[PDB]
Design a protein around this ligand. Sequence first.
Ligand SMILES: Nc1ncnc2c1ncn2[C@@H]1O[C@H](COP(=O)(O)OP(=O)(O)OP(O)(O)=S)[C@@H](O)[C@H]1O
Ligand SMILES: Nc1ncnc2c1ncn2[C@@H]1O[C@H](COP(=O)(O)OP(=O)(O)OP(O)(O)=S)[C@@H](O)[C@H]1O
Ligand SMILES: Nc1ncnc2c1ncn2[C@@H]1O[C@H](COP(=O)(O)OP(=O)(O)OP(O)(O)=S)[C@@H](O)[C@H]1O
Lengths: 686, 686
Amino acid sequence: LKKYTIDLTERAEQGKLDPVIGRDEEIRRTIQVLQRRTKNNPVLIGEPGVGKTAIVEGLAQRIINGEVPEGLKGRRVLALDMGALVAGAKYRGEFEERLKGVLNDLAKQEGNVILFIDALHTMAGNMLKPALARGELHCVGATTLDEYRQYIEKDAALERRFQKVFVAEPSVEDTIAILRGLKERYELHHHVQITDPAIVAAATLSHRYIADRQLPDKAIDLIDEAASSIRMQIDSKPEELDRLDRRIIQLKLEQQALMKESDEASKKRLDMLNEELSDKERQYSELEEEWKAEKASLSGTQTIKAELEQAKIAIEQARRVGDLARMSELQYGKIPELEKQLEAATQLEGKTMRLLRNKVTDAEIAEVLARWTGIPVSRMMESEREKLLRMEQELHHRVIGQNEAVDAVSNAIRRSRAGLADPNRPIGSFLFLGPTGVGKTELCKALANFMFDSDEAMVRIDMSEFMEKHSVSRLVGAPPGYVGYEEGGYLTEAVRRRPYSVILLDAVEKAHPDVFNILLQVLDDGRLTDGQGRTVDFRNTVVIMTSNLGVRETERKSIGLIHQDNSTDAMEEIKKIFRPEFINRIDEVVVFHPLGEQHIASIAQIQLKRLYKRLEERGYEIHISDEALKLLSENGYDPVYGARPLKRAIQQQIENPLAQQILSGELVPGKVIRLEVNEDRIVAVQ
Amino acid sequence: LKKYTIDLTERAEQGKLDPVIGRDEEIRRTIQVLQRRTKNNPVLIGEPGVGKTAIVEGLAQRIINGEVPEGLKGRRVLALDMGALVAGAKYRGEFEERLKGVLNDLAKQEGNVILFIDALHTMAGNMLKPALARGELHCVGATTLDEYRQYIEKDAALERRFQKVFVAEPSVEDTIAILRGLKERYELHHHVQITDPAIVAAATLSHRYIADRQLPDKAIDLIDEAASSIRMQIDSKPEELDRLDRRIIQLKLEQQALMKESDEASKKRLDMLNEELSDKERQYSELEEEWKAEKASLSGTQTIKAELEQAKIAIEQARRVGDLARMSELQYGKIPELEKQLEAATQLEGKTMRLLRNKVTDAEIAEVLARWTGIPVSRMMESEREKLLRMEQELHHRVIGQNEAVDAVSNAIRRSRAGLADPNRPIGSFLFLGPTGVGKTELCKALANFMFDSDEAMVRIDMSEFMEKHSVSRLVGAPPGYVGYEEGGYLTEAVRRRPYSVILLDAVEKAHPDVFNILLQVLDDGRLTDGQGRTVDFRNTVVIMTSNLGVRETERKSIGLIHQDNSTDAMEEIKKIFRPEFINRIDEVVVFHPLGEQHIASIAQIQLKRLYKRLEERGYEIHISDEALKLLSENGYDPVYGARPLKRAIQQQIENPLAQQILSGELVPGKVIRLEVNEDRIVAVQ
Ligand SMILES: Nc1ncnc2c1ncn2[C@@H]1O[C@H](COP(=O)(O)OP(=O)(O)OP(O)(O)=S)[C@@H](O)[C@H]1O
Ligand SMILES: Nc1ncnc2c1ncn2[C@@H]1O[C@H](COP(=O)(O)OP(=O)(O)OP(O)(O)=S)[C@@H](O)[C@H]1O
Ligand SMILES: Nc1ncnc2c1ncn2[C@@H]1O[C@H](COP(=O)(O)OP(=O)(O)OP(O)(O)=S)[C@@H](O)[C@H]1O
């Protein structure tokens, strides 16, 4: 027992370990397990970073304070040491001799040690199950749920002797009570000051966007590491003193260079640099000496921090012994004086700590979490009126015409960012009708590039492939007997990879109606459960649906024809192909129009602009008359596609004779091109 | 104590560590990890040779300069001494005894000395875990990726003990700056001079051809071995001296035989050999003397290297301790003068160096890599445009005929590699018709064997197989839960293995127009989604499509008649059977004709080559009459299948009775065979 167990109550007796904060329902709960005659060995169940070892240790603090119930007193938690057990040796068989010897040793201690085990399922078990079953060994185990189920949930010793009690992770305010629990410990680790929006924003946003790990832990190493970064920033010499310091080192060692001067007559002219030397000396001693004043302020601050910690260790040892006159002479004696000189120190640091910032901001936590997640917290919390009001201009950068669409859609996005919508629905539910490549593709990449900040959030799934009855098994999930019964279909994998994404559904009318029913279910729910066996949320994505029934009616219906016509017979075609309660579950019915010749001209322009970039690579620009712009305007257009042969007319009239000529060497970089017209085409000239 | 530890800091103090170049950021991140109290122990995660130990030692250089922040002021780093554990460990158990005792007197140091351990996955050491749980020491680790992932991913304690730090393989340019750093160390240790394009081209070729190692280490080995080999040339006796040494030692053996003369008219002739001894000994003496002159001057400039480096060491320690008159003494004093007569020595080699060479150049680099890889210096001095011009000639070496294809397609490949169009396209997107066995895969393996230097970049696709809905399931992949998804798409298999491929397609019009549309997605964007759905990028890959619908008119338009008309009536029929989108996708509408009659004779003797090898292995030699060759040309040729029946017509017609005649003994080895013509059969004649 000298070799294999750590007395946790000893380190609690030195105050070497932190107090637990909160979670006394779990503590009392475990106390309600420890009382028990059989199942003397409880099983903690929880995730990493939860606090279960702190449950054990604060339980030991309740032991050493005697605040545990009577009879539970008299026994001492000495937890099983990791790596004292096997431990490390050349042979096999040592493991069982050590197991035996510690069982004889706890046998001769007569229960007065209660034995905690970290990670029960890893640490076999031959001599264990009898002494467990007798109840003589009053140990304690702790593991996770899933690794219990895979270590095993099943077998008779494990389910027999033990009692599983599981926990939750704490709530946001609960984590605030945690950080207000241990913030003094981290402050004397850190010697900084702490803002309250830093910790409530840390718990809230770390709660929201970190789905992997759990409370409290992600908040803990956010606050800890960020505060360490502030320690490194503070404890280094100030950057103005650094930028001065480099040229001042340069003049003081250039002074070393110019003491033994070669020409006292010819290089007597150096005395200007001797005067600048003295000026940099004066301003240098001023800036440095200001920083020494900061060092005196921060030094006295850390002293009254430390002496307040000594007052708290003293008052708590007075709680352990129960010396009440000692408690009064401490709490009236030391504490209010260090409180008032604390407030004088903090108001003085509110005054003169101009250059250095002991206070940490919520903005620091935003920067560190941006360095983990990748999203800037500017994008969370800039002027939301700036981005949300510039959104229309953002669209009319790369999506031309189509004002009604960007209005209704954009306002829907606005009230989505409001939070006024249902948290039991996906974000945006939209139907689009119109030609392809005229801006639909631009709309998807544009909007995912706006909110989801990249074009990658778009997921295209065509429904033209999905015709037969088996199409639902294709895109959703397979039946058994197949690997797709572990894989699922396309959609579940798509949102399964990208939680924050945009879903695109092309030519959606061709499918069987069995598709359309679960389409109604993802319209109602924002959830669906796959062949694999998991629920997949859609509360962080927007479904975008396109059909091509009345797209040969959408080329004509806008602008110049009535929406009641194509709405009547195409909603009638919905009545053939859906029920319009599905239309009740889409949010908007959005219609597009073909482009005016000015739009077509401008998308020819911005289509050329990337070629102007790639000639900016080589060293060229290009000037084009409205004649040749009418050639790309006429040849780049078709009624069936709109803008899709634009690249075709451009490459076929332009890219091949032009870069033909650069493969002839006829074109000199740094000499500008003007694409002047040919006979009836485009030709190139330097 | 003193026995059981290496201090790195006293080594960087005594210059025993190496200077580091350009890794500040991850050092800063490392300090940000090290300032924590828990999980404060970072793990360097990167490939071997990447710079991890150098990051450690350069951090110790910031220690020994005091450049560290005041959070890490005065803290110590001492490296592990495993060899002192086994020093004196006379019996088993004493190793772990000194391990724990050294762990104790380190454990009383308590954070002042911060340990580094490399190769942490190698580290028993379960006993080292609880002292880490106490934090009585402080550690830095360094291991690999999957070592970590099998290492502390399992131990939930150790993932709370540690933390990831990644170091990627750096820029080429900072690696050049690293060589700028230690180039004084390697020129001064290695006695020679090095130019900067040796560093630059060493980085370019070393980065290009060897990715198995990492930066910087491969370039370090190139420079180290390279310049050390130049110094081996300096050591080695020159070639005039050793050729003359051969001639004098033969002159001493032969003349010594002539000195012990017996014959009158034969051996009294020896005086001409004696004056030849006078000649070769004088010339050997003079070239010998000039070699001692070059070794004299080069020895002198080596001494000035040592003297100037002593000025560097003395000025650096002079800047450490701050000895003022020593800094003015050395800086104003030795280093300008030693640079003056240093330039007298480098100018002195600037004239006098005729016999030996000392400056490290790019030819030396190409030699040293040419002696590692065996890849010739011709390959490395090949520019892009060099093989772009050599494409016609080099493929005409293998593939004679089809000058349309090699010349025109060679122009097309120069256009694609040069930058004609949008880079989001496949490199080669054309149509290459022709019957089977007349040059198709011949030209495929020719192409990939030219531009990718191997035949293996090939996959062939049959559209006539692909008439169904499992077509797409075959070539690009079945959906999940379907047959063939285990095979996937064989296209996605070979392209997913080799991204630099050449794709063959066969008889395109027999397929379904889904594959014309999947095909149309291929010819656009330089990409495609597979049956799984993820993108398969095509911008590094040439596709080749045949159609056998011109088979008989291809085999008649083969010898003599121009093959442009095959291309154009191919545009007639194929334009009729297709849509003009796909027609505008392909750039050159090509068709592979069968070879000429004399070219058929060339193919025939090409197959005869290995046969004649087998013959002259045994002393045989077949001559062939051109007429019997012509009978093979009309016989083994198929107007349907080209010359595919020709090979089986060779073995089937002649070779089995040829085996009966060689094996008969009738045909005698050591004798010429001519393929004379006894009757309509071809029968060999001795
Ligand atoms: N409610 C809490 N009160 C105090 N500290 C807590 C609390 N929750 C978590 N912690 C801290 O979070 C860290 C991890 O919790 P632990 O006490 O080690 O238990 P754990 O998360 O279950 O880890 P285990 O038990 O080894 S799997 C410790 O530094 C705890 O002090
Ligand atoms: N910035 C640098 N300046 C100078 N030398 C460097 C630099 N980075 C890497 N090196 C060299 O690269 C060599 C190999 O890298 P290491 O520092 O050993 O880290 P490594 O990736 O762990 O290599 P190992 O030890 O073989 S696993 C070192 O010995 C240095 O000589
Ligand atoms: N242009 C050519 N030059 C020389 N030999 C050729 C040529 N074309 C075909 N051959 C011969 O015919 C054989 C088969 O033709 P290939 O070159 O492979 O064309 P193919 O379409 O792959 O026909 P296969 O291999 O039977 S599917 C080759 O192995 C050669 O022996």
